[PDB]
């Protein structure tokens, strides 16, 4: 069969003196700050995220993030091996998409929603090209650079498949059940097609402006609900065209679900006439240092 090519990604090790924490974003503790590579005359806005297991898991996450490079996947700039390990990534000023849609629900129109669906599917399709199964796709794990540009984040559960490997068989780790494909709940099997199921839930989160899936239903009960054929409901703004795509992502036969590359196509077609596909009140009106350089303009030799 086919073999594996070497992974020549470079893991950049940053010195603590090169980056400055400016303020806490959340809580390990994540800080907003600036990375100032010496003699380079640039200030890059960064997020700085500061137990042997915890250390092993953050290094596995750094390893995956160092191995991805795509406009719709979050950028790792490097790691800092201080007493406490630090992960330095591009600052995404608007935070996660879930919180964003909840906060700006009255100003999110159909064009933004459909474009986000396209961009998330682009990032996922890229991960599929890299044989990476994300295993934690959700609106909480999409970050907002601008209202017009989102990127996938959180590679804490992600796994690289071999050239001839179709599935990742998990052990007993904790996993977000309400976003999981049925075969993952029942059999601990993860594939690109189970990521597609999670994509459908993510789209549902967006289309409801941040509702909780299966709210108030115990995760233990989700398996049986799905087996009886029930799924997340049609969001009020969604035409049947949009809901059909969601439902297809939740087919029990994983190979009957859409592929990410098909989701790009389908949502891009809808994004050309957004009010035909999402029916939103007030859609028409809805709207969202010299040396500072965004990470997307700070290219590091590969």
Domain boundaries, the chain: 16-93+291-297, 95-285
Task: Using alpha carbons, list the distances in angstroms from residue 12 to 43, 65, 212.
Answer: 17, 11, 37
Residues annotated within a binding site for ATP? 25-30, 49, 89-90, 154
In terms of CATH architecture, what is 95-285? Orthogonal Bundle (1.10)
CB 128 within 8 A of CB 97: no
User: Gap positions in the chain, given as the residue before each gap (C–N > 2.5 A)?
Assistant: 27, 50, 288
Query: Residues annotated as binding site?
Result: 25-30, 49, 89-90, 154
- Give, for 149, the enclosing helix (H) or strand (E): strand 149-152
The residues facing 80 across adjacent strands are 86
Tokens of 181: 């494909």
d(Cα 138, Cα 205) in Å, to the nearest integer? 8
65 phi and psi, to 5 degrees? -65, -30
Residue 13 phi, psi (nearest 5) = -105, 115
Contact 46, 78 (CB under 8 A): no
The resolution, in Å, is: 1.6
The DSSP H or E segment spanning 153 is none
Residues recognised as catalytic? 136
Angle at 85 between CA 83 and CA 86, to 5 degrees: 125
d(CA 81, CA 99): 31
**Cα(153)–Cα(99) distance, integer angstroms:** 14
> Would you call 88 helix, strand, or coil by DSSP?
strand
Q: Is 201 exposed, middle or buried (0-12, 13-18, 19+ CB in 10 A)?
A: buried
SS3 state at 215: coil
β-pairing, 189-190 vs 149-152, is: unpaired
Q: Partners of 57 in the beta sheet?
A: none
Is 3.30.9.10 the CATH classification of the domain at 16-93+291-297? no
């Amino acid at each position: 069969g086919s073999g594996e090519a070497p992974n020549q990604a470079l893991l950049r090790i940053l010195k603590e003196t090169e980056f400055k924490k400016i303020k806490v974003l959340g809580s390990g503790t994540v800080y907003k700050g600036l990375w100032i590579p010496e003699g380079e005359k640039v200030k890059i806005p960064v997020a700085i995220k500061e137990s042997p297991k915890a250390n092993k898991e953050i290094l596995d996450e750094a390893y995956v993030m160092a191995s991805v490079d795509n406009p719709h996947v979050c950028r790792l700039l490097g790691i800092c091996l201080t007493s406490t390990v630090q992960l330095i990534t591009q600052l995404m000023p608007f935070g996660c998409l879930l919180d964003y849609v909840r906060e700006h629900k009255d100003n999110i129109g159909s064009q933004y929603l459909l474009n986000w669906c396209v961009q998330i599917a682009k990032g996922m399709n890229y991960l599929e090209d890299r044989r990476l199964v994300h295993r934690d796709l959700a609106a909480r794990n999409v970050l907002v650079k601008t209202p017009q540009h989102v990127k996938i984040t959180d590679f804490g559960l992600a796994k690289l498949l071999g050239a001839e490997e179709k599935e990742y068989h998990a052990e007993g780790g904790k996993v977000p059940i309400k976003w999981m494909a049925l075969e993952s709940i029942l059999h601990r099997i993860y594939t690109h097609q189970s990521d597609v199921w999670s994509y459908g839930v993510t789209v549902w989160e967006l289309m409801t402006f941040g509702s909780k899936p299966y709210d108030g239903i115990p995760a233990s009960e989700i398996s049986s609900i799905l087996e009886k054929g029930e799924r997340l409901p049609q969001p009020p703004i969604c035409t049947i065209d949009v809901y059909m795509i969601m439902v297809k992502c939740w087919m029990i036969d994983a190979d009957s679900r859409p592929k990410f590359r098909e989701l790009i196509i389908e949502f891009s077609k809808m994004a050309r006439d957004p009010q035909r596909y999402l029916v939103i009140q007030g859609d028409e009106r809805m709207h969202l240092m010299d040396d500072v350089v965004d990470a997307d303009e700070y290219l590091i030799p590969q």
